[PDB]
């Protein structure tokens, strides 16, 4: 999981899957938005937060062997830390889940 | 969930309740932005619909 | 000059409203004079707020 | 050391016969700034909460003491770039008017 | 009115035992970019007979279970320290130290019995040996990688000396602790190798490990001043400050010392019922 | 206190004057007592025969304690501002004694049934001790010495090379 | 001596207001004294200057350097009162035992905000057979501010996100599944909505 | 002190009750004054610009001072035993 | 650029462009003047200050590969830190500068 | 009543800077007949912004201008200490 | 912050017409929870002895002071997850009935 | 979810009631809402107690 | 809807200010020049 | 191997030189506590305590540390007109 809190605009820094990650979440009008950078170099920007649909969309981004992040429901900064979670999944289970998505 | 306003008229203050010049400037700028930054987007959206 | 090219190949940058504000006061204090007053009472402050919004 | 654009008795931009926007120098800029500051009203300024004078909560509403008006007005007169201290605040209150008189102290 | 938070955790065989902030706990932590391991001296007051019996008996320093099934926790227990603030029930806790207990004492007599404890980071390696043959003829980065795998730590290496061939680099290392001394010895003083928390870091002296995580500092309890190597100042507990990270400094009393600095050494003085709750920082000019 | 014999009737007792703009602050203060204290410590060495020698004396800043009455509100917050001020040096003129380089270090208001209309206050000033009490000034700005600023950074952060010069010589 | 004819601008009533609730408390007290102390520290060292330059240049100096040397210490406030009932007493004691209590105290014309109880006394004697004497004391937690920063009305914020501290853990609660992998449980939880 | 409205006449003033067997000890003490004291210390850090910040407050044990008259001899023994109890 | 201050006579030292410089600025009657040093060895004395023209005139001074200094407008010690600046250009930038000058 | 004199001299590139006895200066000197060089710890109080900037910035301990035209003063600055007494305006200062 | 299922005049689950147990939001939940806390008696909480109002030792039994009852009731009013502090208490004791009146203060 | 496999090759593992009580409280908080009131007086608290027993 | 015209932009504000406040200036030296230029 | 007074003593670490002269200790000025090597406490001047001798420990505050220990190091703080008149002892388990 990802330890989160109920702030309209925030950032997280952690080491996941033998690599360094930095996620910042910010409200943008109706829906939440995120910017992802791995080991100091940005990957994708302005990705909408939706339940289930992974934040990293692209094979050259999410992994040759890295992981990915998935929301259980639609994001809402009021509910963070209370009934809503963000989950990091490494390569194996993420590949399995992606195959299941079909 | 929380509301967002993002309105140019918010710069107007009741100190300028009956000031013609400042309110004219602000409202004309707001009309220009309305013309070129959200009406155009609505038009382009209606364009992208096949 | 002081414009920020937030549209990059990776994505679109959104900067804090505090930072876009301070950019607007920088523009107006460089344009009129370093000894100007930028508060919401004066018409200058109203212009600053409008530009930031 | 401040400066501002001159305004009339109604808060417009006031233009000379030449039509030139004029950058007023100190003192009179301080007078215009403090006059506009005392007329702000609170809850009106965006990006800055708790800035203004609580007219609708301290003066116009029925109030028991009337020292809150003095505190709020003295604070709004403060926060100006050049104001050093406040010399007087009287608060007459005669009839239905709320008389306010104040003299400010300035670096220049 | 924000309250301060200070937890000390022990990984006892049955499970964790957390000493909360409600008691009298004082801790001093010193970290630097060297091969000498970090240290932490702990003051704990008010421990009852039950907790004294539970804890003080496990810092034996003798050896039991000569058969030695496994390693690590079957020698000495581990301690983890996290400190931070708390506002309106909303927390900002952060971790600052990981280590193992080495020395025990008794400081204050009754009616208030208090103990002092010494902890060191990666002290488990002073007993574990080497069972994987070091590379014979290789470059610097592969030697660092082998050392990281042998110790069991995630590593990051970023040096200009990454493409230099070494001959017999580690053929005279008896335990797992002299690996770090080997790594630091070759290219002093430009190359600095140290172990922080659970990461082995090898880098040039004046390079910031994370270029985009520069913490801007503009509120100093200790007035900044020139100190023969850069700048040195002091602040309250700022969770963002790390070792080898960068800081941007803007001052008021001393506006001539503004700039970017890279952090060299740190000190923590955290107490739950005393005045000191501080962080001392020394920096070097960024390259 | 003898000395001056002016024959002016309405003279002025204790008054604080701003040393920057020659202005009086809190001129409407009802003063009761003024106490001025001087202090010094002489370092002594204990010799061999049995005597005791003194080699030098050290002087500390003096202190002034003033007890006043505040007959209004403007005096009260004027006193508050006087204390909070961080930059201005003040000169104090008691009956016949004039002092310089003082800053307020304390303020103790009081609220008691003994007095409701006014407010008994007790202030305290301390002197800024500086060597060479009498400065030397030149009236010509160019006619002055050389301050020394050492080893700063070029701080970079600049737009370009050609464009700035083409703005500086072409005029725009 | 009529009283209850309190003049405006200086009404001598002590109002204590909780800092988060902003509602008056302990209005059952009958206070007899108030003291305010506002100390500061002033340098006591000889100090040095150049003192051969132009006059206004040296006037620019001897500021700043004097400013470095005057730093304000917290405000101290003392009161003396008589408590008639019980509920006020335990309310004060409960506020005392809390680490996170702040109040704003208003005297005749002096406003002190963000205060905190540091000392409390209670005395009982035959001089008062149905009341108790109190001696409370406060100090200012933090200094006041005038302007600056960015207190915006909406979600806009200075967006502190300092979270360099962590050690990632995978949870187990989710919804259901005993012999099912993490992917199956996550997919089912998704399809629930 | 207001609060309770008894309507009971012969009530009970200051009493020391054991907390194990809820039994009064030295009940025959002529209490003459009672004093109660609280104390706490807040740690302050002296900032750079000129202000001063306070970060937390520490509470110490409270103290009670009682004065009594001993009308007999058994009261003195009971008071000494009260002191020596550990 | 270079950090300056509003004093009629001062001197600032810095390490820029792989070189050690010490500059002195002082008012002399009507216009300003400058003293430039390197290595601790004096370079020039009393360089009159004008806006837009470089401070070092002679070929053996400004570069085999060093830099040069230019004031955007005519110096006035009352205005330093507000509208008037002193910039430093390394060898390549100064070369293209002189190319653009004529 | 004789007064004491304690002067600390600093050799800046532009010239000498002398801290006189009027300020708060404390000094401890240790000398012996050994190969280990002598030591002096100095306590200086009341330095203003101008003097702090002038002096503390030259204690760099890094190297500037690697070309190193000459030596000695182009690395570290030199400090000289002289202490004595003054009586009736008559001095007996001596370097230490 | 608190939440609780609605209960009727009897300590029983009360269901609306459509048949949905309504999860009371704040304010009302605080009042219902305090009412429930005051009725719980001592030594009845499973896995937590020494919680409740000690009627049969402090109120109904013949006493000396009646202060212990006030302390126990003040404790029971507190310890609720959202209550902040108690403003007033009565302990009337008129005739044979034992009146208790209170006015609790909540964070919201 | 809070269930444990306390029957293993070695034998049977008997927990302490603090642990099972915490697990049951977690179960009901996940069932209803992360800010529920679980005390002796409230009905759902009685349900927690019955389930734990 | 592929290309943007920017040659008439300056005129837009140079006359917005003229019909907004009054018919005066819109020159280059005065204060209004910088405001009009930046709004363009 | 160490030299005490006028005697050279060489021995194994955990052997008491005189097995029949174990000094029973039951009165403590310094509360006994675990010492990361054994035990460590403090007492008044006891003439019987020596180096390499044994001690039998019975405690009241800390009854869990009762046992036989062999003395490793000693301390003496003896004054004729001041408070300190003490002995500090550190011990190791007796093999």
* 1-30 in chain B: CB under 8 A from chain A: 1-2, 4
Identify which of A29, A33, A26 has the alpha carbon closest to the alpha carbon of residue A48. A33
Rounded CA separation G98/E3 (Å): 11
Rounded CA separation A86/A1 (Å): 6
Q: How many CB atoms lie within 10 A of CB E78?
A: 17
On whether the CB atoms of residues F144 and G60 are closer than 8 A, the answer is no
Query: Cα angle vertex A44, ends A39, A47, to 5°?
Result: 130
Q: Which of the residues E226, E256, E257, E260 would you substitute to probe the F interface, choosing the one with the greatest number of F C-beta atoms within 10 Å?
A: E256
Distances J36 to E278, J11, J31, J39, J76 between C-alpha atoms, Å? 37, 24, 9, 9, 19
- Containing H77, the helix (H) or strand (E) segment is helix H74-84
Identify which of I33, K76, B20, K61 has the alpha carbon closest to the alpha carbon of residue D7. B20
Rounded CA separation H60/H66 (Å): 19
On whether the CB atoms of residues D51 and G147 are closer than 8 A, the answer is yes
Measured N-to-C along each axis, helices B20-37 and M9-20 cross at an angle, to the nearest 10 degrees, of 150
On whether the CB atoms of residues E265 and E282 are closer than 8 A, the answer is yes
Residues facing residue H63 across a β-bridge = H37
On whether the CB atoms of residues D37 and D76 are closer than 8 A, the answer is yes
Alpha-carbon dihedral sign for residues E239, E245, E246, E252: positive
Query: Cα angle vertex B38, ends B34, B39, to 5°?
Result: 80
Name the residue among D3, D13, D29 with its Cβ closest to that of C43: D13
- What lies within 8 Å, CB to CB, of K14 at 6+ separation is K6, K7, K8
| Nearest chain F alpha carbon to G39 | F106
Number of DSSP helices (H) and strands (E) in chain H, helices first: 1, 3
Rounded CA separation G106/G31 (Å): 13
Distances F76 to D86, F27, F68, G14, I77 between C-alpha atoms, Å? 11, 12, 11, 18, 42
Rounded CA separation F33/F46 (Å): 41
- Containing E156, the helix (H) or strand (E) segment is strand E154-158
Distances H26 to D80, H72, J6 between C-alpha atoms, Å? 69, 11, 72
- Core vs surface per residue D81-99: b (16+ CB within 10 A) or e: bbbbbbeebebeeeeeeee
On whether the CB atoms of residues G41 and F86 are closer than 8 A, the answer is no
What is the DSSP pairing of strand G103-106 with strand G111-125? antiparallel
User: N- to C-terminal Cα distance for chain G?
Assistant: 74
Query: Cα angle vertex D46, ends D42, D50, to 5°?
Result: 35
In this complex, which chains have at least 3 CB pairs below 8 Å with chain D?
Answer: B, C, F, G, M
Identify which of J14, J25, J23 has the alpha carbon closest to the alpha carbon of residue J81. J25
Cis preceding-peptide flag for C14 (omega within 30 of 0): no
Q: How many CB atoms lie within 10 A of CB H60?
A: 10
On whether the CB atoms of residues C6 and C15 are closer than 8 A, the answer is yes
Rounded CA separation M21/M27 (Å): 15
Residues facing residue E17 across a β-bridge = E10
* Alpha helices, H only, E42-106: 49-56
* G54 contacts F138? CB cut-off 8 A: yes
Q: What are phi and psi of M39, to 5 degrees?
A: -65, -15
Q: How many CB atoms lie within 10 A of CB E143?
A: 21
CA atoms within 13 A on the CB side of F64: 23
Contacting residues of J for I15, CB less than 8 Å apart = 64-65
Identify which of E48, E111, E63, E57 has the alpha carbon closest to the alpha carbon of residue N34. E57
| Nearest chain B alpha carbon to A75 | B1
In this complex, which chains have at least 3 CB pairs below 8 Å with chain N?
Answer: E
Radius of gyration of chain C (CA): 13
- What lies within 8 Å, CB to CB, of A68 at 6+ separation is A54, A55, A56, A62, A88, A89, A94
Q: What is the DSSP letter of F138?
A: B
Rounded CA separation M31/M17 (Å): 12
On whether the CB atoms of residues I69 and I88 are closer than 8 A, the answer is yes
The residue count of chain E comes to: 287
DSSP letter string over G82-105? EE-SSHHHHHHHHHHH-SS--EEE
Elucidation method = cryo-EM
- Give L30 to chain A, closest Cα distance, Å: 8
- Core vs surface per residue I41-68: b (16+ CB within 10 A) or e: eebeeebebeebebbbeeeeebbeebbb
Rounded CA separation E148/E194 (Å): 12
On whether the CB atoms of residues M25 and D20 are closer than 8 A, the answer is yes
Name the residue among D47, D66, D75 with its Cβ closest to that of G8: D66
Q: What are phi and psi of K7, to 5 degrees?
A: -125, 150
* 179-238 in chain E: CB under 8 A from chain J: 225-226, 228-229
User: N- to C-terminal Cα distance for chain A?
Assistant: 24
- The whole-angstrom distance between residue F170's C-alpha and the CA centroid of its chain comes to 51
On whether the CB atoms of residues H54 and G139 are closer than 8 A, the answer is yes
| Nearest chain G alpha carbon to H60 | G97
* Alpha helices, H only, chain G: 55-60, 87-97, 182-192
The SS3 call for residue H66 is strand
Burial status of residue E148 (CB atoms within 10 A of its CB: 0-12, 13-18, 19 or more): buried
The SS3 call for residue K69 is helix
Rounded CA separation G28/G132 (Å): 12
- What lies within 8 Å, CB to CB, of L35 at 6+ separation is A82, K1, K2, K3
Burial status of residue N12 (CB atoms within 10 A of its CB: 0-12, 13-18, 19 or more): exposed
Distances G125 to A14, D82, G121, G133, H10 between C-alpha atoms, Å? 63, 56, 14, 9, 19
Rounded CA separation E28/E40 (Å): 6
Name the residue among F151, F161, F168 with its Cβ closest to that of I52: F168
| Nearest chain I alpha carbon to F154 | I2
The SS3 call for residue H67 is strand
Rounded CA separation N54/N70 (Å): 5
Contacting residues of E for H58, CB less than 8 Å apart = 273
* G169 contacts A93? CB cut-off 8 A: no
- What lies within 8 Å, CB to CB, of M23 at 6+ separation is none
Q: How many CB atoms lie within 10 A of CB E107?
A: 13
On whether the CB atoms of residues A96 and A68 are closer than 8 A, the answer is no
- Containing E285, the helix (H) or strand (E) segment is strand E277-285
Q: How many CB atoms lie within 10 A of CB G139?
A: 21
Rounded CA separation I40/J58 (Å): 14
Chain F residues within 8 Å of chain E (Cβ atoms):
149, 152-153, 155
The SS3 call for residue M15 is helix
Number of DSSP helices (H) and strands (E) in chain K, helices first: 3, 4
Rounded CA separation N22/N57 (Å): 10
Rounded CA separation L46/L25 (Å): 11
Is the CB of M29 inside 8 Å of chain C's CB atoms?
Answer: no
- What lies within 8 Å, CB to CB, of K27 at 6+ separation is K106, K108
Chain I residues within 8 Å of chain G (Cβ atoms):
7-8
Rounded CA separation F105/F123 (Å): 8
Alpha-carbon dihedral sign for residues C4, C8, C14, C19: negative
- Core vs surface per residue F126-159: b (16+ CB within 10 A) or e: bbbbbeeeeeeebeebeebebbbbbbbbbeeeee
| Nearest chain A alpha carbon to C15 | A26
On whether the CB atoms of residues K52 and K40 are closer than 8 A, the answer is yes
Identify which of N19, N24, N49, N54 has the alpha carbon closest to the alpha carbon of residue N38. N54
- Does B touch A (3+ CB pairs < 8 Å)? yes
Burial status of residue K88 (CB atoms within 10 A of its CB: 0-12, 13-18, 19 or more): middle
CA atoms within 13 A on the CB side of A65: 3
């Amino acid at each position: 999981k990802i330890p989160l809190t109920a702030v309209p605009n925030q950032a997280i820094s952690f080491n996941a899957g033998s690599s360094y990650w930095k996620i910042r979440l910010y409200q943008n009008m109706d829906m939440m938005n995120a910017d992802i950078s791995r080991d100091g170099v940005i990957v994708c920007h302005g990705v909408r937060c939706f339940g289930g649909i992974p934040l990293l969309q692209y094979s050259h981004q999410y992994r040759p062997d890295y992981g990915n992040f998935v929301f259980d429901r639609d994001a809402d900064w009021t509910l963070f830390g209370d009934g809503i979670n963000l989950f990091y999944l490494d390569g194996a289970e993420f590949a399995e889940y992606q195959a299941l998505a079909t | 969930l929380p509301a967002y306003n993002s309105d140019i008229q918010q710069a107007l203050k009741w100190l300028h309740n009956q000031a013609p010049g400042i309110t004219g400037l602000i409202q004309r700028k707001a009309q220009w932005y309305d013309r070129f930054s959200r009406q155009f987007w609505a038009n382009w959206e209606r364009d992208v619909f096949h | 000059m002081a414009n920020y090219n937030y549209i990059v190949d990776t994505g679109v940058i959104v900067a804090d409203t505090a930072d876009v504000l301070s950019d607007v006061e920088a523009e107006f204090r460089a344009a009129l004079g370093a000894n100007i007053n930028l508060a919401a009472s004066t018409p200058q402050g109203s212009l600053v707020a409008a530009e930031a919004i | 050391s401040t400066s501002t654009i001159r305004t009339g008795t109604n808060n417009d931009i006031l233009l000379d016969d030449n039509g030139n926007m004029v950058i007023l120098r100190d003192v009179e800029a301080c007078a215009q700034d403090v006059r506009a500051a005392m007329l702000m009203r609170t809850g009106e300024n965006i990006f800055d909460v708790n800035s203004g004078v609580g007219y609708f909560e301290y003066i116009f509403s029925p109030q028991k003491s009337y020292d809150d008006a003095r505190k709020s007005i003295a604070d709004a007169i403060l926060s100006s770039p050049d104001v050093t201290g406040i010399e007087q605040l009287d608060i007459d209150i005669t009839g239905e008017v709320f008389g306010v008189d104040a003299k400010v102290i300035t670096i220049h | 009115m924000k309250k301060r938070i200070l937890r000390v955790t022990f990984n006892m065989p049955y499970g964790p035992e957390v000493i909360r902030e409600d008691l009298d706990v004082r801790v001093r932590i010193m970290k630097a970019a060297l091969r000498i391991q970090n240290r932490a001296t702990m003051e704990i007051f008010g421990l009852t007979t039950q907790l004294r019996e539970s804890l003080l008996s496990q810092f034996t320093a003798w050896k039991h279970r000569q058969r030695q099934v496994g390693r690590e926790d079957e020698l000495m227990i581990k301690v983890s320290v996290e400190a931070g603030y708390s506002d309106q029930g909303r927390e900002q806790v952060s971790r600052v130290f990981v280590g193992e207990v080495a020395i025990v004492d008794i400081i204050s007599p009754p009616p208030d019995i208090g103990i002092r404890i010494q902890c060191y980071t990666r002290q488990i390696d002073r007993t574990k040996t080497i069972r994987n043959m070091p590379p014979a003829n290789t470059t610097f980065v592969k030697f660092v990688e082998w050392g990281a795998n042998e110790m069991g730590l995630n590593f990051i290496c970023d040096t200009s000396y990454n493409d230099q061939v070494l001959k017999n680099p580690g053929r005279s290392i008896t335990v797992a602790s002299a690996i770090l001394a080997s790594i630091q010895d070759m290219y002093m003083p430009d190359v600095a190798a140290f172990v922080d928390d659970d990461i082995l870091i090898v880098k040039d002296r004046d390079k910031v490990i994370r270029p985009d995580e520069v913490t801007n500092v503009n509120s100093f309890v200790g007035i900044p001043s020139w100190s023969e190597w850069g700048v040195e100042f002091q602040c309250l507990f700022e969770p963002s400050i790390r070792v080898a990270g960068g800081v941007a400094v803007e001052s008021l009393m001393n506006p001539s010392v503004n700039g970017n600095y890279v952090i060299t050494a740190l000190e923590y003085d955290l107490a739950s019922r005393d005045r000191p709750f501080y962080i001392k920082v020394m920096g070097s000019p960024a390259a | 206190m003898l000395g001056i014999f002016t024959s002016l009737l309405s003279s002025r007792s204790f008054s604080i004057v701003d040393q920057n703009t020659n202005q009086l602050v809190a001129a409407d203060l009802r003063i009761s007592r003024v106490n001025t204290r001087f202090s010094s410590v002489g370092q002594r060495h204990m010799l061999e025969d049995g005597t005791t020698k003194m080699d030098s004396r050290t002087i500390h800043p003096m202190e002034i304690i003033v007890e006043v009455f505040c007959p209004s509100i403007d005096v009260v917050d004027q006193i508050n501002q006087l204390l909070l001020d961080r930059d201005t040096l003040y000169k104090v003129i008691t009956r016949g004694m004039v002092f310089e380089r003082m800053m307020c270090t304390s303020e103790a208001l009081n609220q008691t049934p003994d007095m409701i209309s006014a407010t008994p206050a007790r202030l305290t000033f301390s002197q800024v001790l500086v060597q060479n009490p009498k400065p030397i000034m030149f009236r010509n700005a160019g006619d002055s010495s050389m301050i020394d600023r050492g080893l700063a950074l070029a701080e970079d952060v600049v737009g370009s090379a050609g464009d700035l010069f083409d703005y500086a010589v072409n005029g725009v | 001596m009529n009283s209850f004819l309190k003049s405006i601008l200086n009404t001598p009533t002590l109002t204590i207001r909780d800092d988060v609730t902003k509602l008056p408390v302990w209005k059952s007290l009958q206070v007899k004294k108030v003291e305010i102390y506002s100390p500061a520290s002033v340098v006591s060292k000889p100090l040095a200057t150049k003192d051969q330059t132009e006059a206004q240049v040296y006037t620019e100096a001897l500021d700043i350097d004097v400013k470095n040397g005057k730093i304000i210490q917290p405000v101290r406030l003392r009161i003396n009162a008589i408590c008639p009932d019980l509920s006020t007493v335990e309310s004060i004691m409960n506020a005392f035992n809390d680490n996170t209590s702040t109040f704003a105290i208003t005297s005749k014309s002096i406003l002190a905000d963000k205060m905190a109880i540091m000392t409390l006394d209670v005395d009982q004697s035959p001089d008062m057979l149905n009341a108790a004497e109190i001696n409370m004391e406060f100090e200012q937690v933090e200094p006041p501010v005038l302007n600056k920063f960015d207190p915006a009305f909406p979600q806009d914020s200075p967006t502190y996100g300092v979270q360099i501290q962590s050690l990632s853990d995978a949870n187990l609660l989710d919804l259901g599944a005993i012999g099912d992998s993490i992917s199956s449980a996550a997919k089912s939880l998704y399809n629930r909505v």
